[PDB]
Amino acid sequence: MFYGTVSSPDSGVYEMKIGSIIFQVASGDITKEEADVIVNSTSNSFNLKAGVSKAILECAGQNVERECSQQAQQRKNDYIITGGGFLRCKNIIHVIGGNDVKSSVSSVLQECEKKNYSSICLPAIGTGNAKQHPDKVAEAIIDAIEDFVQKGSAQSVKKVKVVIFLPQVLDVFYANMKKREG
Ligand SMILES: CC(=O)Nc1ccccc1O
Ligand SMILES: [Cl-]
Ligand SMILES: [Cl-]
């Protein structure tokens, strides 16, 4: 059930179908990507600037930084949605790196359906400052997408891409895809 075949459409990029969704992984700088939503993996204060969060907040700009701290003071949030600033996206969804990764990805998918968005790009959530294990993170991200497909929830969402800072973490994601393939 659900899983297609792993192939490489471009050097260093690997993909497979999960239901109707194209799931892709690659190594690189996520701030150079274009997608409807880019995901940030941050602290429970939404003001971290270390690792992926440093690159995202510096490239998005000061207006996005201020939107984050404004929402953080308003209520207790599991995640926040801001504009894209100077990134090539419509919105940034800022998730907490130390939280359950399957839950965080499920929330991102649901928010993207609510906006009728088609494409998402995320980092290896939790593997930076939060120091979650890469094998557990890969299993959680792919499980969230499988659950979303099984429930019949994929309508607008067509492409989910993980852009991963360390090539060694990319290798862990690729092995998990091969374990699942049809
Ligand atoms: C998960 C995470 O923070 N990754 C990352 C991305 C870019 C630079 C440094 C990094 O550690
Ligand atoms: Cl993290
Ligand atoms: Cl990453």
Coordinates of N, CA, C and O and ligand atoms in Angstrom, one line a residue:
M1 N 0.8 -1.3 0.0 CA 0.0 0.0 0.0 C 0.8 1.3 0.0 O 2.0 1.3 0.5
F2 N 0.3 2.3 -0.6 CA 0.6 3.7 -0.8 C 1.9 4.1 -1.6 O 1.9 5.1 -2.3
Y3 N 2.9 3.3 -1.4 CA 4.3 3.7 -1.8 C 4.6 3.3 -3.3 O 4.5 2.1 -3.6
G4 N 5.1 4.2 -4.0 CA 5.7 4.0 -5.4 C 7.2 3.6 -5.3 O 7.6 3.0 -4.3
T5 N 7.9 4.0 -6.3 CA 9.3 3.5 -6.5 C 10.3 4.7 -6.3 O 10.0 5.8 -6.8
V6 N 11.4 4.5 -5.7 CA 12.4 5.5 -5.5 C 13.3 5.7 -6.8 O 13.8 4.7 -7.3
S7 N 13.4 6.9 -7.3 CA 14.2 7.3 -8.4 C 14.9 8.6 -8.2 O 14.6 9.3 -7.2
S8 N 15.8 9.0 -9.1 CA 16.5 10.3 -9.0 C 16.3 11.1 -10.3 O 16.9 10.8 -11.3
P9 N 15.4 12.2 -10.2 CA 15.1 13.0 -11.3 C 16.2 14.0 -11.7 O 16.2 14.5 -12.9
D10 N 17.1 14.3 -10.8 CA 18.2 15.3 -10.9 C 19.4 14.8 -10.0 O 19.1 14.2 -9.0
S11 N 20.6 15.2 -10.3 CA 21.7 14.7 -9.4 C 21.5 15.1 -8.0 O 21.1 16.3 -7.7
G12 N 21.7 14.2 -7.0 CA 21.5 14.4 -5.6 C 20.0 14.6 -5.1 O 19.8 14.9 -3.9
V13 N 19.0 14.4 -6.0 CA 17.6 14.5 -5.6 C 17.0 13.1 -5.8 O 17.2 12.4 -6.8
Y14 N 16.2 12.7 -4.8 CA 15.5 11.4 -4.8 C 14.1 11.6 -4.5 O 13.7 12.5 -3.7
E15 N 13.2 10.8 -5.2 CA 11.8 11.0 -5.1 C 11.0 9.7 -5.1 O 11.5 8.7 -5.7
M16 N 9.8 9.7 -4.6 CA 8.9 8.6 -4.7 C 7.4 9.1 -4.5 O 7.2 10.1 -3.8
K17 N 6.5 8.4 -5.1 CA 5.1 8.7 -4.8 C 4.6 8.1 -3.4 O 5.0 7.0 -3.1
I18 N 3.8 8.9 -2.7 CA 3.1 8.4 -1.5 C 1.6 8.8 -1.8 O 1.3 9.9 -1.7
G19 N 0.8 7.8 -2.2 CA -0.5 8.1 -2.8 C -0.3 9.0 -4.0 O 0.6 8.7 -4.9
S20 N -1.0 10.1 -4.0 CA -0.9 11.1 -5.1 C 0.2 12.1 -4.9 O 0.4 12.9 -5.9
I21 N 0.9 12.1 -3.8 CA 1.9 13.2 -3.5 C 3.3 12.7 -3.9 O 3.7 11.6 -3.7
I22 N 4.0 13.6 -4.6 CA 5.4 13.4 -4.9 C 6.2 13.8 -3.6 O 6.2 15.0 -3.2
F23 N 7.0 12.9 -3.0 CA 7.8 13.1 -1.9 C 9.3 13.1 -2.4 O 9.7 12.2 -3.0
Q24 N 10.0 14.2 -2.1 CA 11.4 14.4 -2.6 C 12.3 14.7 -1.4 O 11.9 15.4 -0.5
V25 N 13.6 14.3 -1.5 CA 14.7 14.7 -0.6 C 15.9 15.2 -1.4 O 16.2 14.6 -2.5
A26 N 16.6 16.2 -0.9 CA 17.9 16.7 -1.5 C 18.7 17.4 -0.4 O 18.1 17.8 0.6
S27 N 20.0 17.5 -0.5 CA 20.8 18.3 0.4 C 21.0 19.7 -0.2 O 21.0 19.9 -1.4
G28 N 21.1 20.7 0.7 CA 21.3 22.1 0.3 C 20.8 23.1 1.2 O 20.5 22.8 2.4
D29 N 20.8 24.4 0.8 CA 20.3 25.5 1.6 C 18.8 25.8 1.3 O 18.5 26.2 0.2
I30 N 18.0 25.5 2.2 CA 16.5 25.7 2.1 C 16.1 27.1 1.7 O 15.0 27.3 1.1
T31 N 16.9 28.1 2.1 CA 16.5 29.5 1.8 C 16.6 29.9 0.3 O 16.1 31.0 0.0
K32 N 17.1 29.0 -0.5 CA 17.2 29.2 -1.9 C 16.0 28.5 -2.7 O 15.9 28.7 -3.9
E33 N 15.1 27.9 -2.0 CA 14.0 27.1 -2.5 C 12.8 28.0 -2.8 O 12.6 29.0 -2.1
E34 N 12.0 27.6 -3.8 CA 10.6 28.2 -4.0 C 9.5 27.2 -3.7 O 9.6 26.1 -4.2
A35 N 8.5 27.6 -2.9 CA 7.4 26.7 -2.6 C 6.3 27.6 -2.1 O 6.5 28.7 -1.6
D36 N 5.0 27.0 -2.0 CA 4.0 27.8 -1.4 C 4.3 28.1 0.1 O 4.1 29.2 0.6
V37 N 4.7 27.0 0.8 CA 5.1 27.1 2.2 C 6.6 26.6 2.4 O 6.9 25.5 1.9
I38 N 7.4 27.3 3.2 CA 8.7 26.9 3.7 C 8.5 26.7 5.2 O 7.9 27.6 5.9
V39 N 9.0 25.6 5.8 CA 8.9 25.4 7.2 C 10.3 25.7 7.9 O 11.3 25.4 7.4
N40 N 10.1 26.4 9.1 CA 11.2 26.8 10.0 C 11.1 25.8 11.2 O 10.1 25.6 11.7
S41 N 12.3 25.3 11.7 CA 12.4 24.5 12.9 C 13.0 25.4 14.0 O 14.2 25.6 13.9
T42 N 12.3 25.8 15.0 CA 12.7 26.9 15.9 C 12.5 26.5 17.4 O 12.1 25.3 17.7
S43 N 12.7 27.4 18.3 CA 12.4 27.2 19.7 C 11.0 27.5 20.1 O 10.2 28.1 19.3
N44 N 10.6 27.2 21.4 CA 9.3 27.5 21.8 C 8.9 29.0 22.0 O 7.7 29.4 22.1
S45 N 9.9 29.9 21.8 CA 9.8 31.4 21.8 C 9.8 32.0 20.3 O 9.5 33.2 20.2
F46 N 10.0 31.1 19.3 CA 9.9 31.5 17.9 C 11.0 32.6 17.6 O 10.7 33.4 16.7
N47 N 12.1 32.6 18.3 CA 13.1 33.7 18.2 C 14.5 33.1 18.1 O 15.5 33.8 18.2
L48 N 14.7 31.8 17.9 CA 16.0 31.2 17.7 C 16.7 31.7 16.4 O 16.0 31.9 15.4
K49 N 18.0 31.8 16.4 CA 18.7 32.2 15.2 C 20.0 31.4 15.2 O 21.1 32.0 15.3
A50 N 19.9 30.1 15.1 CA 21.0 29.2 15.1 C 20.7 28.0 14.1 O 19.5 27.6 14.1
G51 N 21.6 27.6 13.3 CA 21.4 26.6 12.3 C 20.3 27.0 11.3 O 20.4 28.2 10.8
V52 N 19.4 26.2 10.9 CA 18.4 26.5 9.9 C 17.7 27.8 10.2 O 17.4 28.6 9.3
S53 N 17.3 28.0 11.5 CA 16.6 29.2 11.9 C 17.4 30.4 11.7 O 16.7 31.5 11.4
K54 N 18.7 30.4 11.8 CA 19.5 31.6 11.5 C 19.4 32.0 10.1 O 19.1 33.1 9.7
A55 N 19.5 31.0 9.2 CA 19.4 31.3 7.7 C 18.0 31.8 7.3 O 17.9 32.7 6.6
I56 N 17.0 31.1 7.8 CA 15.6 31.5 7.5 C 15.3 32.9 8.0 O 14.8 33.7 7.2
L57 N 15.6 33.2 9.3 CA 15.3 34.6 9.8 C 16.1 35.7 9.1 O 15.5 36.8 8.8
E58 N 17.4 35.4 8.9 CA 18.2 36.4 8.2 C 17.8 36.7 6.7 O 17.7 37.9 6.3
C59 N 17.4 35.6 6.0 CA 17.0 35.8 4.6 C 15.5 36.3 4.5 O 15.2 37.1 3.6
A60 N 14.6 35.9 5.4 CA 13.2 36.4 5.4 C 13.1 37.9 5.8 O 12.3 38.6 5.2
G61 N 13.9 38.3 6.8 CA 14.0 39.7 7.1 C 13.3 40.1 8.4 O 12.6 39.3 9.0
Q62 N 13.6 41.3 8.8 CA 13.2 41.8 10.1 C 11.6 41.9 10.4 O 11.2 41.7 11.5
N63 N 10.9 42.1 9.3 CA 9.4 42.1 9.4 C 8.9 40.8 9.9 O 8.0 40.7 10.7
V64 N 9.4 39.7 9.3 CA 9.0 38.3 9.7 C 9.5 38.0 11.2 O 8.7 37.5 12.0
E65 N 10.7 38.5 11.6 CA 11.2 38.3 12.9 C 10.2 39.0 13.9 O 9.9 38.4 14.9
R66 N 9.8 40.2 13.6 CA 8.8 40.9 14.4 C 7.4 40.3 14.5 O 6.8 40.2 15.6
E67 N 6.9 39.8 13.4 CA 5.6 39.0 13.3 C 5.7 37.8 14.3 O 4.7 37.5 15.0
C68 N 6.8 37.1 14.3 CA 7.0 35.9 15.2 C 6.9 36.3 16.7 O 6.2 35.6 17.4
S69 N 7.6 37.3 17.1 CA 7.6 37.7 18.5 C 6.3 38.3 19.0 O 5.9 38.1 20.1
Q70 N 5.6 39.0 18.0 CA 4.3 39.5 18.3 C 3.3 38.4 18.5 O 2.5 38.4 19.5
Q71 N 3.3 37.3 17.7 CA 2.3 36.2 17.9 C 2.7 35.4 19.2 O 1.8 34.9 19.9
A72 N 4.0 35.2 19.5 CA 4.5 34.5 20.6 C 4.0 35.0 21.9 O 3.6 34.3 22.9
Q73 N 3.9 36.4 22.0 CA 3.4 37.0 23.3 C 1.8 37.0 23.4 O 1.3 37.2 24.5
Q74 N 1.1 36.8 22.3 CA -0.4 36.8 22.3 C -1.0 35.6 22.9 O -2.1 35.8 23.6
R75 N -0.5 34.4 22.7 CA -1.0 33.2 23.2 C 0.1 32.1 23.3 O 1.2 32.3 22.7
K76 N -0.2 30.9 23.9 CA 0.7 29.8 23.8 C 0.4 29.0 22.5 O -0.6 28.4 22.3
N77 N 1.4 29.0 21.6 CA 1.3 28.4 20.3 C 2.2 27.1 20.2 O 3.3 27.1 20.5
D78 N 1.6 26.1 19.5 CA 2.4 24.9 19.1 C 3.2 25.2 17.8 O 4.3 24.6 17.6
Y79 N 2.7 26.2 17.0 CA 3.4 26.6 15.8 C 2.8 28.0 15.4 O 1.7 28.3 15.9
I80 N 3.4 28.8 14.6 CA 2.9 30.0 14.1 C 3.1 30.1 12.5 O 4.0 29.6 11.9
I81 N 2.2 30.9 11.9 CA 2.2 31.1 10.5 C 2.5 32.6 10.2 O 1.7 33.5 10.8
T82 N 3.5 32.9 9.5 CA 3.8 34.3 9.1 C 3.8 34.5 7.6 O 3.8 33.5 6.8
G83 N 4.0 35.7 7.1 CA 4.3 35.9 5.7 C 5.7 35.3 5.4 O 6.5 34.9 6.3
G84 N 6.0 35.3 4.1 CA 7.3 34.8 3.6 C 8.5 35.8 3.6 O 9.6 35.4 3.4
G85 N 8.2 37.1 3.8 CA 9.3 38.1 3.8 C 10.0 38.1 2.5 O 9.3 38.0 1.4
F86 N 11.3 38.1 2.5 CA 12.1 38.0 1.3 C 12.5 36.5 0.9 O 13.3 36.3 0.0
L87 N 11.9 35.5 1.5 CA 12.0 34.2 0.9 C 11.0 34.0 -0.3 O 10.0 34.7 -0.4
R88 N 11.3 33.0 -1.1 CA 10.4 32.7 -2.3 C 9.3 31.7 -1.9 O 9.2 30.6 -2.3
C89 N 8.4 32.2 -1.1 CA 7.2 31.5 -0.6 C 6.1 32.4 -0.3 O 6.3 33.7 -0.1
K90 N 4.9 31.9 -0.1 CA 3.7 32.6 0.3 C 3.6 32.8 1.8 O 3.1 33.8 2.3
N91 N 3.9 31.7 2.5 CA 3.9 31.7 4.0 C 5.1 30.9 4.5 O 5.5 29.9 3.9
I92 N 5.6 31.3 5.7 CA 6.5 30.4 6.5 C 5.7 29.8 7.7 O 4.9 30.6 8.4
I93 N 5.8 28.5 7.9 CA 5.2 27.9 9.1 C 6.4 27.6 10.0 O 7.3 26.8 9.6
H94 N 6.4 28.2 11.2 CA 7.4 28.0 12.2 C 7.0 27.0 13.2 O 6.0 27.2 14.0
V95 N 7.6 25.8 13.2 CA 7.3 24.7 14.2 C 8.4 24.6 15.2 O 9.5 25.1 15.0
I96 N 8.1 24.0 16.4 CA 9.0 23.8 17.5 C 9.9 22.6 17.3 O 9.3 21.4 17.3
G97 N 11.2 22.7 17.1 CA 12.1 21.6 16.8 C 12.0 20.4 17.9 O 12.2 19.3 17.5
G98 N 11.8 20.8 19.1 CA 11.7 19.7 20.2 C 10.4 19.0 20.3 O 10.3 18.0 21.0
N99 N 9.3 19.5 19.6 CA 8.0 18.8 19.6 C 8.0 17.5 18.8 O 8.9 17.3 18.0
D100 N 7.0 16.7 19.0 CA 6.7 15.5 18.2 C 6.7 15.9 16.7 O 5.9 16.7 16.3
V101 N 7.6 15.3 15.9 CA 7.8 15.7 14.5 C 6.6 15.2 13.7 O 6.2 16.0 12.8
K102 N 6.1 14.0 14.0 CA 4.9 13.6 13.2 C 3.7 14.6 13.4 O 3.0 15.0 12.4
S103 N 3.5 15.0 14.6 CA 2.4 16.0 14.9 C 2.7 17.3 14.2 O 1.7 17.9 13.6
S104 N 3.9 17.8 14.2 CA 4.3 19.1 13.5 C 4.0 19.0 12.0 O 3.4 19.9 11.4
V105 N 4.4 17.9 11.4 CA 4.2 17.7 9.9 C 2.7 17.6 9.6 O 2.2 18.2 8.6
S106 N 2.0 16.8 10.4 CA 0.5 16.7 10.2 C -0.1 18.1 10.3 O -1.0 18.4 9.4
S107 N 0.3 19.0 11.2 CA -0.3 20.4 11.3 C 0.1 21.2 10.0 O -0.8 21.9 9.5
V108 N 1.3 21.1 9.5 CA 1.7 21.8 8.3 C 0.9 21.4 7.1 O 0.4 22.2 6.3
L109 N 0.6 20.0 6.9 CA -0.2 19.5 5.8 C -1.6 20.1 5.9 O -2.2 20.5 4.9
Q110 N -2.2 20.1 7.1 CA -3.6 20.5 7.3 C -3.7 22.0 7.0 O -4.7 22.5 6.3
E111 N -2.7 22.8 7.4 CA -2.7 24.3 7.1 C -2.6 24.6 5.6 O -3.2 25.5 5.1
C112 N -1.8 23.7 5.0 CA -1.6 23.9 3.5 C -2.9 23.6 2.7 O -3.2 24.3 1.8
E113 N -3.6 22.5 3.1 CA -4.9 22.2 2.5 C -5.9 23.4 2.7 O -6.7 23.7 1.8
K114 N -5.9 24.0 3.9 CA -6.8 25.1 4.3 C -6.6 26.3 3.3 O -7.6 27.0 3.0
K115 N -5.3 26.5 2.9 CA -5.0 27.6 1.9 C -5.0 27.2 0.4 O -4.7 28.0 -0.4
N116 N -5.4 25.9 0.2 CA -5.4 25.4 -1.2 C -4.0 25.4 -1.9 O -3.8 25.6 -3.1
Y117 N -2.9 25.2 -1.0 CA -1.5 25.2 -1.5 C -1.2 23.8 -2.1 O -1.7 22.8 -1.6
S118 N -0.2 23.9 -3.0 CA 0.2 22.6 -3.7 C 1.6 22.1 -3.3 O 1.9 20.9 -3.5
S119 N 2.5 23.1 -2.9 CA 3.9 22.7 -2.6 C 4.4 23.1 -1.2 O 4.1 24.3 -0.8
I120 N 5.2 22.3 -0.6 CA 5.8 22.5 0.7 C 7.3 22.1 0.6 O 7.7 21.1 0.0
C121 N 8.1 22.9 1.3 CA 9.5 22.5 1.5 C 9.9 22.7 3.0 O 9.5 23.7 3.6
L122 N 10.5 21.6 3.6 CA 10.8 21.6 5.0 C 12.3 21.1 5.2 O 12.8 20.4 4.3
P123 N 12.9 21.5 6.4 CA 14.2 20.9 6.8 C 14.0 19.6 7.5 O 12.8 19.1 7.7
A124 N 15.1 18.9 7.9 CA 15.0 17.7 8.8 C 14.7 18.2 10.2 O 15.6 18.3 11.1
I125 N 13.4 18.5 10.4 CA 12.9 19.2 11.7 C 13.4 18.4 12.9 O 13.2 17.2 13.0
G126 N 13.9 19.2 13.9 CA 14.4 18.6 15.1 C 15.8 18.1 15.2 O 16.3 17.8 16.3
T127 N 16.5 18.0 14.1 CA 17.9 17.5 14.1 C 19.0 18.5 14.4 O 20.1 18.1 14.6
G128 N 18.6 19.8 14.4 CA 19.5 20.8 14.8 C 19.6 21.1 16.3 O 20.0 20.2 17.1
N129 N 19.2 22.3 16.7 CA 19.3 22.7 18.1 C 18.6 21.6 19.1 O 19.0 21.4 20.2
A130 N 17.5 21.1 18.6 CA 16.7 20.1 19.4 C 17.4 18.8 19.6 O 17.0 18.0 20.6
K131 N 18.3 18.4 18.8 CA 19.1 17.2 18.9 C 18.2 15.9 19.0 O 18.5 15.0 19.8
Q132 N 17.2 15.8 18.2 CA 16.5 14.6 17.9 C 17.3 13.7 16.9 O 18.0 14.3 16.0
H133 N 17.1 12.4 17.0 CA 17.9 11.5 16.2 C 17.4 11.5 14.7 O 16.2 11.3 14.5
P134 N 18.3 11.6 13.7 CA 17.9 11.6 12.3 C 17.0 10.4 11.9 O 16.0 10.7 11.1
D135 N 17.3 9.2 12.4 CA 16.5 8.0 12.0 C 15.0 8.2 12.4 O 14.1 7.9 11.6
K136 N 14.8 8.6 13.6 CA 13.4 8.8 14.2 C 12.7 10.0 13.5 O 11.5 9.9 13.2
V137 N 13.5 11.1 13.2 CA 12.9 12.2 12.4 C 12.4 11.8 11.0 O 11.3 12.1 10.6
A138 N 13.2 11.0 10.3 CA 12.8 10.6 9.0 C 11.6 9.7 9.0 O 10.6 9.9 8.2
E139 N 11.6 8.8 10.0 CA 10.4 7.9 10.1 C 9.1 8.7 10.4 O 8.0 8.4 9.9
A140 N 9.2 9.7 11.3 CA 8.1 10.6 11.7 C 7.6 11.4 10.5 O 6.3 11.5 10.3
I141 N 8.5 12.0 9.7 CA 8.0 12.9 8.6 C 7.3 12.0 7.6 O 6.1 12.4 7.1
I142 N 7.8 10.9 7.2 CA 7.2 10.0 6.2 C 5.9 9.4 6.7 O 4.9 9.4 6.0
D143 N 5.9 9.0 8.0 CA 4.6 8.5 8.6 C 3.5 9.6 8.6 O 2.3 9.2 8.4
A144 N 3.8 10.9 8.9 CA 2.8 11.9 8.8 C 2.2 12.0 7.4 O 0.9 12.2 7.3
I145 N 3.0 11.9 6.4 CA 2.5 12.0 5.0 C 1.6 10.7 4.7 O 0.5 10.9 4.1
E146 N 2.1 9.5 5.1 CA 1.3 8.3 4.9 C -0.1 8.4 5.5 O -1.1 8.1 4.9
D147 N -0.1 8.9 6.8 CA -1.4 9.1 7.5 C -2.4 10.0 6.8 O -3.6 9.8 6.7
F148 N -1.8 11.2 6.3 CA -2.6 12.2 5.6 C -3.2 11.6 4.3 O -4.4 11.8 4.1
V149 N -2.5 10.8 3.6 CA -2.9 10.1 2.4 C -4.0 9.0 2.7 O -5.0 9.0 2.1
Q150 N -3.7 8.3 3.8 CA -4.7 7.2 4.2 C -6.0 7.7 4.5 O -7.1 7.1 4.2
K151 N -6.1 8.9 5.2 CA -7.3 9.5 5.6 C -8.1 10.2 4.4 O -9.2 10.7 4.6
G152 N -7.5 10.2 3.2 CA -8.1 10.8 2.1 C -8.0 12.3 2.1 O -8.8 13.0 1.4
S153 N -7.0 12.9 2.8 CA -7.0 14.3 3.0 C -6.2 15.1 1.9 O -6.4 16.3 1.9
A154 N -5.4 14.4 1.1 CA -4.7 15.1 0.1 C -5.6 15.4 -1.1 O -6.3 14.6 -1.7
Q155 N -5.7 16.7 -1.3 CA -6.6 17.3 -2.4 C -5.8 18.4 -3.1 O -5.5 18.2 -4.3
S156 N -5.4 19.5 -2.5 CA -4.6 20.5 -3.1 C -3.1 20.1 -3.0 O -2.3 20.5 -3.9
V157 N -2.6 19.5 -1.9 CA -1.1 19.3 -1.7 C -0.7 18.2 -2.7 O -1.2 17.1 -2.8
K158 N 0.3 18.5 -3.5 CA 0.9 17.6 -4.6 C 2.4 17.3 -4.4 O 2.8 16.3 -5.0
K159 N 3.2 18.2 -3.7 CA 4.6 18.0 -3.6 C 5.1 18.4 -2.2 O 4.8 19.5 -1.8
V160 N 5.9 17.5 -1.6 CA 6.5 17.7 -0.3 C 8.0 17.4 -0.5 O 8.3 16.2 -0.8
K161 N 8.8 18.4 -0.3 CA 10.3 18.3 -0.5 C 11.0 18.6 0.8 O 10.8 19.6 1.5
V162 N 11.9 17.7 1.3 CA 12.8 17.9 2.4 C 14.2 18.3 1.9 O 14.8 17.5 1.2
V163 N 14.6 19.6 2.2 CA 15.9 20.1 1.8 C 16.8 20.0 3.1 O 16.4 20.7 4.1
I164 N 17.9 19.3 3.1 CA 18.6 18.8 4.3 C 20.0 19.4 4.3 O 20.8 19.2 3.3
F165 N 20.4 20.0 5.4 CA 21.7 20.7 5.5 C 22.9 19.7 5.4 O 23.8 20.0 4.6
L166 N 22.8 18.6 6.1 CA 23.9 17.7 6.1 C 23.7 16.5 5.2 O 22.7 15.7 5.4
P167 N 24.6 16.2 4.2 CA 24.5 15.0 3.4 C 24.4 13.7 4.2 O 23.6 12.8 3.7
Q168 N 25.0 13.6 5.3 CA 24.8 12.4 6.1 C 23.4 12.1 6.6 O 22.9 11.0 6.8
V169 N 22.6 13.2 6.9 CA 21.2 13.1 7.2 C 20.4 12.7 6.0 O 19.4 11.9 6.0
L170 N 20.7 13.3 4.8 CA 20.1 12.9 3.6 C 20.2 11.3 3.4 O 19.2 10.7 3.0
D171 N 21.4 10.8 3.7 CA 21.5 9.3 3.5 C 20.5 8.5 4.3 O 20.0 7.5 3.9
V172 N 20.3 9.0 5.6 CA 19.3 8.4 6.5 C 17.8 8.4 5.8 O 17.1 7.4 5.9
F173 N 17.5 9.6 5.3 CA 16.2 9.7 4.6 C 16.0 8.8 3.4 O 15.0 8.1 3.2
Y174 N 17.1 8.7 2.6 CA 17.1 7.8 1.4 C 16.9 6.4 1.8 O 16.1 5.6 1.2
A175 N 17.6 5.9 2.9 CA 17.4 4.5 3.3 C 16.0 4.2 3.8 O 15.4 3.2 3.5
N176 N 15.4 5.2 4.4 CA 14.0 5.1 4.9 C 13.0 4.9 3.7 O 12.1 4.1 3.7
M177 N 13.2 5.8 2.7 CA 12.4 5.6 1.4 C 12.5 4.2 0.8 O 11.5 3.6 0.4
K178 N 13.8 3.7 0.7 CA 14.0 2.4 0.1 C 13.3 1.3 1.0 O 12.8 0.3 0.4
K179 N 13.3 1.4 2.3 CA 12.7 0.5 3.1 C 11.2 0.4 2.8 O 10.6 -0.7 2.8
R180 N 10.6 1.5 2.5 CA 9.1 1.6 2.2 C 8.6 1.3 0.8 O 7.5 1.0 0.5
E181 N 9.5 1.3 -0.2 CA 9.1 1.4 -1.6 C 8.4 0.1 -2.0 O 8.6 -1.0 -1.5
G182 N 7.4 0.3 -3.0 CA 6.7 -0.8 -3.5 C 7.5 -1.9 -4.2 O 8.6 -1.7 -4.6
Ligands
LIG1 C1 18.0 21.3 11.4 C2 19.0 22.4 11.2 O1 19.1 23.3 12.0 N1 19.7 22.3 10.0 C3 20.6 23.3 9.5 C4 20.3 24.0 8.3 C5 21.2 25.0 7.9 C6 22.3 25.3 8.6 C7 22.6 24.6 9.8 C8 21.7 23.6 10.3 O2 21.9 22.9 11.4
CL2 CL 15.8 21.7 15.4
CL3 CL 18.2 20.1 8.0

